[PDB]
């Protein structure tokens, strides 16, 4: 139960030498695949703007803001 | 740059000024080895 | 003697598992061409 007494044991380091790299790789693959952009709706570095027009897609309606975001995302 | 014969030691020269800071860190490592007695 | 899975274990791991996941994600962000 003391933290030093468990981090200085071998079983802890076997278990966590397994688990910690797997979580690190899972986060790495969450970003490097591009799934984070799709999940959180964060624009990719080429999808901030449309083809030619430079207008920030601010939402201006409260109840149809979801449709405004979908309309902007349909333009690229 | 460096003299042209001293060309393969550029990474070593690149990490040379960092070294004194490590000495400070080394003291704590030594103090951790003796349990800060 | 000492049990394994206690409240302290839950608190530590709810703080620590997403920490390592986010650190891996942030490193993969470090290697993104800007």
């Amino acid at each position: 139960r003391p933290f030093s007494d468990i981090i200085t044991s071998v079983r802890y380091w076997v278990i966590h030498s397994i688990t910690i790299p797997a979580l690190f790789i899972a986060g790495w693959l969450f970003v490097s695949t591009g799934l984070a952009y799709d999940v959180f709706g964060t624009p990719r570095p080429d999808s901030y703007y449309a083809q030619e027009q430079r207008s920030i897609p601010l939402v201006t309606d409260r109840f149809e803001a979801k449709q405004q975001v979908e309309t902007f995302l349909e333009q690229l | 740059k460096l003299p042209e014969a001293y060309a393969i030691f550029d990474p070593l020269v690149d990490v040379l000024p960092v070294i004194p800071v490590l000495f400070l860190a080394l003291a704590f490592v030594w103090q951790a080895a003796v349990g800060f007695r | 003697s000492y049990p394994i899975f206690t409240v302290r274990w839950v608190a530590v791991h709810t703080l620590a598992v997403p920490t390592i996941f986010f650190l891996g994600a942030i490193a993969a962000m470090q290697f993104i061409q800007r």
Partner: peptide
């Protein structure tokens, strides 16, 4: 048997330093 505590502390510190240095390296790139 038991890993010395100072070894764990040193390697955790070095991992922390490498992570922070990688963040600053990405901040410069």
């Amino acid at each position: 048997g038991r890993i010395p505590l100072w070894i764990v502390a040193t390697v955790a510190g070095m991992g922390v330093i490498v992570i922070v240095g990688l963040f600053f390296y990405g901040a410069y790139a």
